[PDB]
Amino acid sequence: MTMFEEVEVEAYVYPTEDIRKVKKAMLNLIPGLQFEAFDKGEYVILVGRTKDKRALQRLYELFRGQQILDTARMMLEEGYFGEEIIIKVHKQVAYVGKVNFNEDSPLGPITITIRTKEPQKLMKWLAPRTKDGVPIE
Amino acid sequence: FEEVEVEAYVYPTEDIRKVKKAMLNLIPGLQFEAFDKGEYVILVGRTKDKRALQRLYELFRGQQILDTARMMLEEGYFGEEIIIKVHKQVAYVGKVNFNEDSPLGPITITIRTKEPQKLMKWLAPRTKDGVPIE
């Protein structure tokens, strides 16, 4: 059964940007998003949402294959408040399909918000603490 | 002036044609070269046309920003070179904004001129409450 209620991904789309390319960057990280877009004049807010229990599978895989479980876990923990876990990733690196937590993204990070009633279990499943691949928690 | 050169980065989520549009909104008649740097492309435009600064001349006056423009030209000035940085997204809609936290980097305009004092005085005369004092 599901480990989260919903995933919401948010990014700003600037006038010199392509809304389609920003949608692609978001889907690279969380597949199957349903988009709404909101006009703010100086940019558009793109919001992606999914309640699909398999929505975190791409992150699960990228954290492991990039070998960034330690950084991923630190970022999840920093973003953990109440019933939400929020991370911010590099927009341009997401467009080429990887995760980068460097907060200095040509303009605007992509923000990923995970709404969950079991955040300790989510974080331990998504970004386990390991030593040479061996569980240390 | 002898030349106007204009530079901007094009990031992967950007459309090069939109960045070109923004540059041309500010300095018409530019010829471009593009340089791939991987994480972004560098776009560089150029023109020697003597009407190359009329849009800026006009926009500085129309937007009533003669004070900020002169201050930015002076800050950017030495010798035969005046460099200013303008907001890319505002340039895309056709205006000048000298606020430098520009989404996806600024557009950098270089004016090359043998007579930069005459240049600054003509383009953005010193003003008091908007009223030119020279």
DSSP state at residue B106: P
How far is it between the farthest Cα atoms of chain B?
A: 48
Torsion angle of C-alpha atoms A123, A124, A126, A132, degrees rounded to 10: 130
The DSSP element (H or E) to which A86 belongs, if any, is: strand A84-90
Interchain contact B24–A (C-beta under 8 A): no
The DSSP element (H or E) to which B31 belongs, if any, is: strand B31-36
Mutation to test the B interface, candidates A12, A13, A16, A107, most B Cβ within 10 Å? A16
Domain hosting residue A77, numbered range: 1-136
Q: A108 in helix, strand or coil?
A: coil
CA distances from A71 to A8, A56, A101, B104 (A): 21, 17, 8, 26
Tokens, residue B39: 């994480």
Question: How many domains would you assign to chain B?
Answer: 1
Cβ–Cβ gap B12/A42 under 8 Å: no
Would you say A29 and A110 are in contact if contact means Cβ atoms under 8 Å apart?
A: yes
How far is the C-alpha of A89 from the C-alpha of A55, rounded, in Å?
A: 17
Tokens, residue B112: 């090359």
Q: A117 in helix, strand or coil?
A: coil
The DSSP element (H or E) to which A35 belongs, if any, is: strand A34-39
Tokens, residue B22: 């923004």
Scan for tokens 């988009």, then name that residue: A35
Cβ-nearest to B14 among A12, A16, A43: A16
Q: Which residues in chain A have Cβ-Cβ distances shorter than 8 Å to B12? A: 21, 92, 95-96
Q: A51 in helix, strand or coil?
A: coil
Report the DSSP beta bridge partners of residue B134. none
Domain of A33: which CATH number? 3.30.1440.10
- Experimental method of this PDB entry: X-ray
DSSP state at residue A15: T
